[PDB]
Design a protein around this nucleic acid. Structure first.
Ligand SMILES: [Mg+2]
Ligand SMILES: [Mg+2]
Ligand SMILES: [Mg+2]
Ligand SMILES: [Mg+2]
Ligand SMILES: [Mg+2]
Ligand SMILES: [Mg+2]
Ligand SMILES: [Mg+2]
Ligand SMILES: [Mg+2]
Ligand SMILES: [Mg+2]
Ligand SMILES: [Mg+2]
Ligand SMILES: [Mg+2]
Ligand SMILES: [Mg+2]
Ligand SMILES: [Mg+2]
Ligand SMILES: [Mg+2]
Ligand SMILES: [Mg+2]
Ligand SMILES: [Mg+2]
Ligand SMILES: [Mg+2]
Ligand SMILES: [Mg+2]
Ligand SMILES: [Mg+2]
Ligand SMILES: [Mg+2]
Lengths: 150, 81, 129, 155, 144
RNA sequence: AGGAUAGUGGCCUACCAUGGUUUCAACGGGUAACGGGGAAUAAGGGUUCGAUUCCGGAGAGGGAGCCUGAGAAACGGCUACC
RNA sequence: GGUCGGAUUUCCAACGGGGCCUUUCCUUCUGGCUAACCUUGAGUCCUUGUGGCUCUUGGCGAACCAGGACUUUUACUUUGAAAAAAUUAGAGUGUUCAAAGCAGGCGUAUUGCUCGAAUAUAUUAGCAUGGAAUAAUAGAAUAGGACG
RNA sequence: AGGGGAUCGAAGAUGAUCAGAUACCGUCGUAGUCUUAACCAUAAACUAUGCCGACUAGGGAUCGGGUGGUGUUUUUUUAAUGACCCACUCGGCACCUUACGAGAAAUCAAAGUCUUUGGGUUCUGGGGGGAGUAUGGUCGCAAGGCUGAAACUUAAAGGAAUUG
């Protein structure tokens, strides 16, 4: 594993065997959907909405309690972002490293890490263009990449 | 051992194993109803929260995130499920 | 990464059989694996096997009768004509009388003798003896 | 092609031996010849009710379709009324019992009854030599959706 | 996967790898370079003719100790100079100088024989007559 | 679009457009390469060869050009040059 | 074994193909098929059987001809065909044998009779065909979806 | 090319040793050693062991994270937390035993699951020299690096182990 490292950690979630769950959840699907929508109004990404719903509330899996997954819900309600969440966070990291590099020219493993992050950005963006989420000829051009993530 | 029931292992052996490495993988985590020092409103808290979960009456804290299970805030009571 | 789930399954059975185990676990249990195991089962090379249903790809526990010498995969799945089945059996099988080369045909996954009497051909999956 | 400069060359463009009588004023002003190229290929309505000429068209021109029917992928629409398609195929090398990816580039005449974009899968039919390199006409296009319905600006 | 590619669609890679690695073989390299026609005393042929330039006494390699009785020959078709061993007890007397000689390789496809240093050809005929026939007295050299 | 051809075609011409091939090896270089049917050896897979009894192609010292003819750019036809 | 251990056959078994039913596409409208006749007016003249019937009660006229409100593409494999002759393998034939060759053989040699000159393989590409496992590909998501 | 230049110190000097000593040893000593801005791109750059995936044996120690003990320990006496103990678990640097198995052996839990030969994939080798030479190209200020033959020559070169 670890596309850009020699790590081999496994460390994931083990979601339950039950697809209908969990027999102590008395809340309604539409109630969870509206809580998802207002978190998306507050500018939370689907990962953050799912974390909040699991900790603060008893939402084990939004796709289980509701009918479908969180990014699908937000896209249904017009709350989809311009670029996917994971692509946004990779571009954000590349921008942060690049602004570290402009002030630290000797930081060569920062330069090495920036190459890894940008390689991860281009592979992801290539996927998203193939499944037609990003428009074709969408490109991370690395000079005005601060525009689309801030 | 050379002959053993791989379809029906002991519950002690399964409980010993990693969550991903049991016969059917599943979570070792749970959910808790937590009663705050102030009010008797039911709030459900994940075991391995990652959120500093707060309530309405004691709108500061119920659990503190850790590297694993969250720790309750020293003034609450809790029940599993 | 995992490239052939059938190669992994047949390796696990081989390494279990060679060490003397009566049982072996297999993950992740494709249906090609299931059909391959059924062809081995109908010829007595394994015993009864179980499909465990996790909600991802399943697992299999196979029971072993000690009569399997070697089960293997042929990768890549070479295209096999009717008239070059016998050269695969010559290359792979210890004797002409026993042992089976498993093929996948539009008529289904089967051994080479069932392929001969149905007069069908396809790709090679593996062998068993 | 009712518009966009059908008569854009030094000679008057017309279908040979098709006569528009200046006297008898039938309410179309244009006799347009057309044919069905055959082999179950439907004549496009664009050919029927158009006004382009294209003597190399298989529906309104003099050419005919006979011989090989091939499929390909449009890789270039840069020439005028000519596309290049890419025909990939697997070539079997017996010694290794394996194949290698191989491709051919076919230059194909395309009638203005057809709109083709780089990426469209096209059915082409053999005709007589049109050019130095061209021996096929487009008889069918297979651009239905283009997977471009979800690649636009979002509010 | 023990190295080499195994995909059903890797025929190009396997055939090119074989092409690249056949240059490591002596025979394939020599044949495809055309070295016998280009860089070889006989221009790739089995035998050649030449004129005896001079008789040589070649001291054999150790641990042997002998004079090996070769001749310097200039090949008619090339002009190249070669050294050819004259095989038998005597038979150097039969060779003389300015005589035409038919030379052959010796059997080591190049690669000078035995204890004779740098000699890779042997005289088979002299003046159109077999050395074997001259040595066994079956025939005589044409004086005129 | 025209010309030419037995006829299609940049085959050629005028005008116009900027195309066409290529790491799936284009372009170039080498070949002690005519191609194939085939041949030798070979458990199987392969390796090497095929100027040469049949099929196709090319040439008649090297080029080019042409006459007669249904048919030749013919060479036991012509013309010129080397 | 009624021909001095050799047909016959639901006694069947074992292989192999097809159709149908179980929620089950096998697209399609024009018209000649007139159902292994869905529905048995008239008739069960064979000493009893569930292996053999006649003009039929408008009778799903779906048992093939040439045109689509008609076509997801591809690899793979099956069969067929094509892959000149010679050659290769190989059938027949006492070239005295054999390499070969395609001959030859049998009479009533009195008026000629007759067997042959097979078959297979021939790789890839193209062509027709069955299959639908394997491996790709495509489909309804701002419904611009299908059914009608 | 600047800066710095304590130290040690290719060069050089010098004192020894010895037949010689332009070497080892002694005392100095430029470059260098350090830094900044550029080059270079090579090491026995080594685990002489490509990467990804699966499986095959036992054990204890250890680093990081986690989970569980009406387990010790200090702090108010013990709460907790820390630290420690025990038991598990994931990941990691390794180690030990054995030889299933492998190997020519040395040895190796991978160098195993290989003539019972096919999980995916990249690179490289084809007797010893000539030779990493010559030539061309390309990179470099240079030193040099990358790519890289042939003619010719040769019966061995080599690996691991055994006895002496
Ligand atoms: Mg990695
Ligand atoms: Mg990678
Ligand atoms: Mg893993
Ligand atoms: Mg490789
Ligand atoms: Mg023209
Ligand atoms: Mg030649
Ligand atoms: Mg030839
Ligand atoms: Mg020839
Ligand atoms: Mg010649
Ligand atoms: Mg000629
Ligand atoms: Mg001559
Ligand atoms: Mg002439
Ligand atoms: Mg003559
Ligand atoms: Mg002549
Ligand atoms: Mg004979
Ligand atoms: Mg190196
Ligand atoms: Mg190395
Ligand atoms: Mg470590
Ligand atoms: Mg060698
Ligand atoms: Mg060598």
């Amino acid at each position: 594993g670890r596309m850009h490292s020699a790590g081999k950690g496994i460390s994931s979630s083990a979601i339950p065997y039950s697809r209908n769950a969990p027999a102590w959840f008395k809340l309604s699907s539409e109630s969870v959907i509206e809580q998802i929508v207002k978190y998306a109004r507050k500018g939370l990404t689907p990962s953050q909405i799912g974390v909040l719903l699991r900790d603060a509330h008893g939402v084990t899996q939004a796709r289980v309690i509701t009918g479908n997954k969180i990014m699908r819900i937000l896209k249904s309600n017009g709350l989809a972002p311009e670029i996917p969440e994971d692509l946004y966070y990779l571009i954000k990291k590349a921008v942060s490293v690049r602004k570290h590099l402009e002030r630290n020219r000797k930081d060569k493993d920062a330069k090495f890490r920036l190459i890894l992050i940008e390689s991860r950005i281009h592979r992801l963006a290539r996927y998203y263009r193939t499944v037609a989420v990003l428009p074709p000829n969408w490109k991370y051009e690395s000079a005005t990449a601060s525009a689309l993530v801030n | 051992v050379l002959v053993q029931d791989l379809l029906h292992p002991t519950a002690a052996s399964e409980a010993r194993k990693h969550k991903l490495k049991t016969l059917v993988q599943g979570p070792r985590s749970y959910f808790l109803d937590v009663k705050c020092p102030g009010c008797l409103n039911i709030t459900t808290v994940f075991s391995h929260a990652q959120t500093a979960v707060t309530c309405e009456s004691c709108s500061t804290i119920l659990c503190t995130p850790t590297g694993g299970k969250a720790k309750l805030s020293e003034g609450t009571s809790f029940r599993r499920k | 990464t995992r490239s052939s789930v059938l190669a992994d399954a047949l390796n696990a059975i081989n390494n279990a059989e060679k060490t003397g185990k009566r049982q072996v676990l297999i993950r992740p249990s494709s249906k090609v694996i299931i059909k391959f195991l059924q062809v081995m089962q109908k010829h007595g090379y394994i015993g009864e096997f179980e499909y465990i249903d996790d909600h991802r790809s399943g697992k299999i526990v196979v029971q072993l009768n000690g009569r399997l010498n070697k089960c293997g995969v042929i990768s890549p799945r070479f295209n096999v004509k009717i008239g070059d089945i016998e050269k695969w059996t010559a290359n792979l099988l210890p004797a002409r009388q026993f042992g089976y080369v498993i093929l996948t045909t539009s008529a289904g996954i089967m051994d080479h003798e069932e392929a001969r009497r149905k007069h069908v051909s396809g790709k090679i999956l593996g062998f068993v003896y | 092609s009712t518009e966009l400069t059908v008569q854009s060359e030094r000679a008057f463009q017309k279908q040979p031996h098709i006569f528009n009588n200046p006297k008898v004023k039938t309410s179309k002003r244009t006799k347009r010849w057309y044919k069905n190229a055959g082999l179950g290929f439907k004549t496009p309505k664009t050919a029927i009710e158009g006004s382009y000429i294209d003597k190399k068209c298989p529906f309104t021109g003099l050419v005919s379709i006979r011989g090989k029917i091939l499929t390909g992928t449009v890789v270039s629409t840069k020439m005028h009324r000519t596309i290049v398609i890419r025909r990939a195929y697997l070539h079997y090398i017996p010694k290794y019992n394996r194949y290698e990816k191989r491709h051919k580039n076919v230059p194909v005449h395309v009638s203005p009854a057809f709109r083709v974009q780089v990426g469209d899968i096209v059915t082409v039919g053999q005709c007589r030599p049109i050019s130095k390199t061209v021996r096929f006409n487009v008889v069918k296009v297979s651009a239905a959706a283009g997977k471009a319905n979800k690649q636009f600006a979002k509010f | 996967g023990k190295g080499k590619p195994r995909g059903l669609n890797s025929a190009r890679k396997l055939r090119v790898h074989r092409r690249n690695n056949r240059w490591a073989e002596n025979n394939y390299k020599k044949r495809l370079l055309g070295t016998a026609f280009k860089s070889s005393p006989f221009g790739g042929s089995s035998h050649a003719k030449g004129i005896v330039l001079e008789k040589l006494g070649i001291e054999s390699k150790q641990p042997n100790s002998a004079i090996r009785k070769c001749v310097r020959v200039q090949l008619i078709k090339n002009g190249k100079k070669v050294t050819a061993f004259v095989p038998n007890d005597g038979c150097l007397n039969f060779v003389d100088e300015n005589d035409e000689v038919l030379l052959a390789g010796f059997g080591r496809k190049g690669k000078a024989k035995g204890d004779i240093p740098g000699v890779r050809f042997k005289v088979v005929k002299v003046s159109g007559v077999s050395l074997l026939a001259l040595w066994k007295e079956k025939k005589e050299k044409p004086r005129s």
